[PDB]
Amino acid sequence: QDLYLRELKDTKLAPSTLQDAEGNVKPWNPPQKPNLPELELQGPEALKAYTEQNVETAHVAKESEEGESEPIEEDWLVLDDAEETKESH
Amino acid sequence: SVLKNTSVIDKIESYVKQYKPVKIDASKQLQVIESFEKHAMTNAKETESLVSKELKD
Numbered sequence: 001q002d003l004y005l006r007e008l009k010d011t012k013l014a015p016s017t018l019q020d021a022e023g024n025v026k027p028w029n030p031p032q033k034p035n036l037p038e039l040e041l042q043g044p045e046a047l048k049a050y051t052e053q054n055v056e057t058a059h060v061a062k063e064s065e066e067g068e069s070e071p072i073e074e075d076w077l078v079l080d081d082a083e084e085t086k087e088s089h
Numbered sequence: 090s091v092l093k094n095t096s097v098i099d100k101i102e103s104y105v106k107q108y109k110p111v112k113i114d115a116s117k118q119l120q121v122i123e124s125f126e127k128h129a130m131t132n133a134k135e136t137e138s139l140v141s142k143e144l145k146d
Contacts, residue, residue, distance in 0.1 A: 056101070056104060058108035063115060065117065066118045066122070071125060075124070076128075079132065
C-alpha cells in the first residue's frame with residue numbers, strides 16, 4: 001500500500017542522490033563528495049604509514065660477509081690460544 | 090575480492106611479483122671456510138699421528 005510505497009519513493013529522493021546517485025546531497029549543508037572519495041580515500045593510508053609500508057619498500061636484504069677471509073692472522077693465533085686453553089684444559 | 094574498492098591490490102600484487110626474485114643466497118665462503126678446515130686437517134692428523142705412535146710406544 002501507498003504509505004510504504006511513498007516512503008519507498010522517499011528512499012528514491014533523499015538518499016537516491018546520497019549513494020544511489022552522485023548528486024551530492026540537498027538537506028546537508030556540508031558536501032558529501034570531498035570527504036570519503038578524495039580525503040578519506042587516502043584515509044586508510046592516513047591511518048597507516050605512507051610511502052614506506054603501503055609502497056611496502058621491497059628492500060634488498062643487507063649482505064653480511066664472512067670473517068673477512070683472513071685466516072692466517074687468526075687461525076694460528078687461535079691455534080696458539082688453543083695451546084693456552086689445552087694447558088688449562 | 091573481499092575489497093570492492095580494490096584500486097591498489099593489483100599494484101600490490103604486481104609489487105610482490107616484481108620483487109618475487111627477492112635476493113639470492115650468499116655462498117661466498119669457498120676459500121676461507123676450507124682454510125679453517127685446512128688447519129683442521131693439519132692439527133688433527135698431527136695429533137692422530139702422535140697418539141697412534143705413542144699408544145703403541
